[PDB]
Amino acid sequence: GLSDGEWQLVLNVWGKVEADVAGHGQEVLIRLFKGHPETLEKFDSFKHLKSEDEMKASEDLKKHGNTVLTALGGILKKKGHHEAELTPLAQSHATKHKIPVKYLEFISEAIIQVLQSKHPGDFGADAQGAMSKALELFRNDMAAKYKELGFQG
Ligand code: HEM
């Protein structure tokens, strides 16, 4: 875990995302698709997008962006007590979506890149380090759920 002080820095930076969830959501997915093109192959719905301008115009890529960050905000707010919010996500992603754990790592980096690009003034050394342990915790718990569902990539 994170210390009480580290969860506080995490919740505080999250207050910035919550002031514009779909806009931050939309940039996280463009960063991911631009950055690791191969993750795009998992979305039937989006494989047609051939460029950043097309991804930027997609009202559906923006609604999916919103859904991902709304679901991640619900986990973060539990501060580590997220079993229940997490199980269902580990079940769909392992079994239905078939998302390997390095892909969870690539989205973690897109989230940090977005926070840094849009809130540099608020996203200092300290907030950067808490945010990154908070996302490694999420990944590590998801990978553990994977293993007991008996899968794993
Ligand atoms: C921060 C990590 C993530 C969160 C919180 C998250 C959350 C969600 C949620 C809430 C849904 C809708 C319900 C469901 O099927 O469970 C969803 C669907 C989906 N997710 Fe994720 N996700 C994450 C990472 C990823 C990654 C890394 C990929 C693949 C590169 C991915 C692929 C998918 C697909 C293919 C679907 C179905 C989307 C569709 O309707 O076509 N997810 N995700």
Swiss-Prot record:
Residues 1-147 form the Globin domain. The keyword Phosphoprotein applies. It is found in: Cytoplasm, Sarcoplasm. GO terms for biological process: oxygen transport; removal of superoxide radicals. GO terms for cellular component: sarcoplasm. It holds the Pfam family Globin. Belongs to the globin family. Monomeric heme protein which primary function is to store oxygen and facilitate its diffusion within muscle tissues. Reversibly binds oxygen through a pentacoordinated heme iron and enables its timely and efficient release as needed during periods of heightened demand. Depending on the oxidative conditions of tissues and cells, and in addition to its ability to bind oxygen, it also has a nitrite reductase activity whereby it regulates the production of bioactive nitric oxide. This is Myoglobin. It comes from Sus scrofa.
